Amino acid sequence: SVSKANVPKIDVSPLFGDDQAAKMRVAQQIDAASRDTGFFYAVNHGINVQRLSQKTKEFHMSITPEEKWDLAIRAYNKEHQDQVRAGYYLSIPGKKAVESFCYLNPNFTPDHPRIQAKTPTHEVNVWPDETKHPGFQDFAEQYYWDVFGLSSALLKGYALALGKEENFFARHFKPDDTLASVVLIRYPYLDPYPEAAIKTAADGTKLSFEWHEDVSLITVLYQSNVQNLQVETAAGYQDIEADDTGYLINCGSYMAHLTNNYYKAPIHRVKWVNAERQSLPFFVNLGYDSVIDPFDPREPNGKSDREPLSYGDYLQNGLVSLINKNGQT
Template sequence: MTNLAKVLLKGFALAAGQDEHFFDDKIRVDDTMSTLRLNYYPFLDNIEAVEVAEDGTRLGCETHRDCTLVTILYQPIEGLQVEDDAAGWIDVPPSESNFVINTGALMSRWTNGVFKAANHRVKFVNMERVSVPFFTEPYFYCPIENFTPKNSAQSLLNETVIYGNYLIEANKKIKEYQN
């Protein structure tokens, strides 16, 4: 998965006007913070949704943006929705042969907002299912110095931070990691 992530990151770097190798030294196999999770959701009698959204949708996972550069997701069962500013919540079709790629808050920060973090949620589906996300992250002490795209008058938005410190602060806002 790390190799796939590195290929994707080359494309993101080029699309943002940077050298294709911009992220190469930040995603290091020997000390990356990248994480592969296997999420198993069994069918359970009498279980309730984690939360009910403002629009009345019952959720199995709260609305959030990943803290990562990109998340590569295998999700063969329906449930994932992404938010579109114009269209609202859009169902992401499940697939057993494709990945879903979400840009994360770190990608947005690092690219000075060129790429927006995908706001997403998972509808409550009480059935046995599996999802497998790969959260692409740099090494703990990696300096996050956002860049201004070439040919842009946009000023820098964020100060340089160390990734590990950024991650610790970002995780404090996620319900799953509180308490």
């Protein structure tokens, strides 16, 4: 009895090239989708998602409990006080089903200026032992750059969609400094499935993760072919169909801020499904000091009554608030 959300499939391949007219026609599609449900699938994106899913499966299914403590973020291992964002997010059998591995910009090395300054939200990635997970770090770091490239193209399309020059957002999205993250989330099959790991929405829907807006500029998401996401619209929560060949794209609340809610951050949630599956977001974050002056494409002079917000301020505030609201994940 739940209706299907409108989530168009947009061929984003022009965004990689030099046909300006064609890019405008993609931008229009992005504009339409962003004004409607706030979701679309990017197709013709060039990324080998089957291989991503296979490498990720090999990792999730071979990592051991020992390795998970050794990689754990601070919320699970108090010895790892520098790991707020990057590392392993453990399950809790009987209580919490989901588990995940998060990594940041591979350029955040020990000698990076923001790591030396101990700037919040910047960390040096932690990795399992190479001999236990051969090839994994190298694959994961290359994936970061492949999805970075897609995301830069997408950001060209959002900039054109909003009446700007194509580098309006991408000029703030740079390999040396982006705060973007990849999260490799495992949602398990469990028999029996612990009730304590199932939340219940006001409308009675069983959930794995409650309603929220994303903490991002845009989110660039690969998921297995198991339907699970729902978007709130004017006609209520609607099901977002799965497509394990595309990337699911939506705006996060930084985009809503910069656009004066012209491109809303859609409110969405994750249904509980008893199936072994993957959820692999790339959160498109800018640099710590990046500031985009807010504007309003519905107003003749483009002016907004919002104040400029630096991305770093936005991000550290947002991640903490999301944990408080919906739980440590």
